From a paper:
We demonstrated the IMISX-EP approach for both heavy atom derivatization methods with two membrane proteins, BacA and PgpB. Indeed, BacA is the first de novo structure solved by the IMISX-EP method. BacA crystals were derivatized by in situ soaking with HgCl2 in IMISX wells directly. From the 968 BacA crystals identified, two groups were created with which to evaluate two phasing methods. One contained 360, the other 271 data sets. The first group was used successfully for SAD phasing with SHELXD and CRANK2. Another advantage is the ease with which heavy atom and ligand-soaking experiments can be performed in true in situ fashion without ever touching the crystals, which remain suspended in the viscous mesophase.
Responding to this critical need, we introduce here a fully automated method for collecting, selecting, and merging data from hundreds to thousands of in meso-grown microcrystals. This approach boosts the collective phasing signal of many tiny crystals to a level where de novo phasing of highly challenging membrane protein targets becomes not only possible but also fast and high-throughput. We refer to it as the in meso in situ serial crystallography—experimental phasing (IMISX-EP) method. IMISX-EP has three components: (1) in meso crystallization (and in situ soaking where appropriate), (2) fast, automated grid scanning, and serial data collection in situ, and (3) real-time data processing and selection of data sets followed by structure solution.
Numbering used by the authors: 4 to 76, 86 to 216, 224 to 273
The structure:
């Protein structure tokens, strides 16, 4: 009776922490450990429900995503070249270091990426310019998009919260918190869709239906609130929250 309940608990977690700088992978290992869902099947299940979070960004940015690829229906406009430049370096670094990255998945490394990721969010807050260089999404430049991407190499460290890494570099390149968040979401669509496909390949029954779907729903609510929320809130509360999670990763496993 609780196979569906566990998937609901894991789904609301994944959908919530996927696009918030709070280390989706870190929350899953602690909750999966507290529940007892730790087998290889759990990891496969977790990659599946990541697809639901993807579709949430797909439906949230349906008009803009297809716009980048030519399916329409400041005066600049964000182009597909921005997305490509944002994902070139992580792909190149991710392809070359696959066996090495997969070795970093122990919980101790998550504890550090939780702390170090929070330090970076603080440094982005203290160091970001007073006047944003790109207050809107369509104001971004190829240099900002690429520097954000070369900054996404850190997300290959398990527990770093790819959103937190991507948004930090956005703020440090002069992109507003709102646009830096919008770009991290749009950038996650090609990244997650390809990465999960890459993970679904090497890993091979209705428990997915609950998890995939409920993660799609919660992500929509979180991703819509967070964008409206971040208009008036900083990333300091998120960075400090990652420290409380880091102690928990130590608490649950050590
Ligand atoms: C009192 C309740 C909270 C208890 C936990 C205390 C947090 C201390 C932990 C780590 C250091 C964090 C460094 C402090 C963050 C920077 C403070 C700040 O003012 O940020 C600058 C601003 O965001 C841009 O101008
Ligand atoms: C990735 C590794 C993580 C390492 C963590 C680094 C931690 C704190 C750096 C804080 C730097 C604080 C510098 C203070 C400068 C300042 O106060 O602002 C200057 C000006 O406002 C600029 O626009
Ligand atoms: C669109 C992305 C969907 C990914 C699905 C996928 O890659 O599945 C792997 C394949 O089933 C391996 O047998
Ligand atoms: C499982 C919990 C997952 C993420 C919670 C992380 C939330 C940490 C940051 C919360 C910021 C916030 O909620 O601010 C709202 C405020 O009340 C408006 O004024
Ligand atoms: Hg890089």
């Amino acid at each position: 009776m609780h196979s569906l309940l566990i998937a609901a608990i894991l789904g609301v977690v994944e959908g919530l922490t996927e696009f918030l700088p709070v280390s989706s992978t870190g929350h899953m290992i602690i909750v999966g450990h507290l529940l007892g869902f730790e087998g290889d099947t759990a990891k496969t299940f977790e990659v599946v429900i990541q697809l639901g979070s993807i579709l949430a960004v797909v439906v949230m940015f349906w008009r803009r995503l297809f716009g980048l690829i030519g399916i329409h229906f400041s005066k600049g406009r964000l182009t597909l070249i921005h997305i490509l430049l944002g994902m070139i370096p992580a792909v190149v670094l991710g392809l070359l270091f696959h066996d090495t990255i997969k070795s970093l998945f122990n919980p101790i490394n998550v504890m550090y990426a939780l702390v170090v990721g929070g330090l970076l969010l603080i440094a982005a807050e203290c160091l970001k310019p007073k006047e944003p260089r790109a207050p809107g999404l369509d104001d971004m430049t190829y240099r900002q998009a690429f520097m954000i991407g070369c900054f996404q190499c850190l997300a290959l460290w398990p527990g770093f919260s790819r959103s937190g890494a991507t948004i930090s570099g956005g703020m440090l390149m002069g992109v507003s918190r709102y646009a830096a968040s919008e770009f991290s979401f749009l950038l996650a669509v090609p990244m997650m869709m390809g990465a999960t496909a890459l993970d679904l390949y090497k890993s091979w029954i209705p428990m997915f239906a609950v998890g995939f779907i409920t993660a799609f729903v919660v992500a929509l609510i979180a991703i819509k609130t967070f964008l409206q929320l971040i208009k008036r809130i900083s990333f300091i509360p998120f960075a400090i929250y990652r420290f409380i999670v880091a102690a928990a990763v130590y608490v649950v496993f050590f």
